[PDB]
């Protein structure tokens, strides 16, 4: 169970695939415009900020992070988010971050 999101380099959701409803319970519009960190368990928040900071330094390769995401039922679900930057080489527009977000076991 997974869904795709795009983020600005700050962490804000700018696109959310509707498979999020079955993965974490929210409609896309409940995620759009908020920072992913707003859905992250307080122990994991700094890891996730530092992951978004680093993924831009990794020359477009994949960075993974595991963290606890707050479902629409206010329960903590373990997620594995694999992220990479994309910048269209015909332009000099700011890169953005593409994430795949899967509910995973912590075992």
């Amino acid at each position: 169970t997974r869904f795709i999101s795009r983020h600005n380099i700050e962490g804000i959701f700018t696109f959310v695939d509707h498979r999020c409803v079955a993965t974490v319970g929210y409609q896309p519009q409940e995620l759009l415009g908020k920072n992913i960190v707003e859905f992250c368990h307080p122990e994991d928040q700094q890891l996730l900020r530092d992951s978004f900071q680093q993924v831009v330094k990794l020359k477009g390769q994949v960075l993974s992070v595991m963290f606890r995401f707050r479902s629409k039922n206010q329960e903590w679900l373990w997620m594995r988010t694999s992220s990479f930057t994309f910048q269209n080489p015909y332009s000099d527009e700011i890169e953005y971050i593409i994430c795949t977000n899967t509910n995973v076991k912590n075992s």
Binding site: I4, V62, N88, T100
Partner: protein, 107 residues
């Protein structure tokens, strides 16, 4: 004339290259509705004259983890072809995430 976001769309594929998700931006650009792509391999859609080069590019993706396709043609929904370029990234293998950029109108 179209801006960059409107010519780019994301897609996800299983490791057998079948579409598992596609952004609705493809409809305006190539004619397909995302739900009619699901379960169909990318190979159904490459121009005959690109098929050998794409097979090599898939090998390269499976050996390196991440590849840029170079220019190739997608069969459009009502016939003819659109030129695209793709960045493909394997998510580890679980799925392949593609960022697709249209280089042409339907020809």
């Amino acid at each position: 004339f179209k801006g960059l976001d409107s010519k780019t769309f994301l897609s996800e594929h299983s490791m057998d290259m079948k579409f598992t998700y596609c952004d609705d931006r493809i409809t305006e650009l190539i004619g397909y509705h995302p739900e009619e792509l699901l379960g169909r391999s990318a190979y159904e859609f490459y121009h005959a004259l690109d098929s050998e080069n794409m097979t090599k590019s898939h090998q390269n993706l499976c050996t390196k983890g991440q590849v840029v396709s170079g220019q190739y043609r997608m069969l459009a929904k009502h016939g003819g072809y659109v030129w695209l370029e793709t960045q493909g990234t394997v998510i580890y293998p679980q799925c392949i995430m593609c960022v697709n950029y249209v280089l042409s109108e339907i020809e």
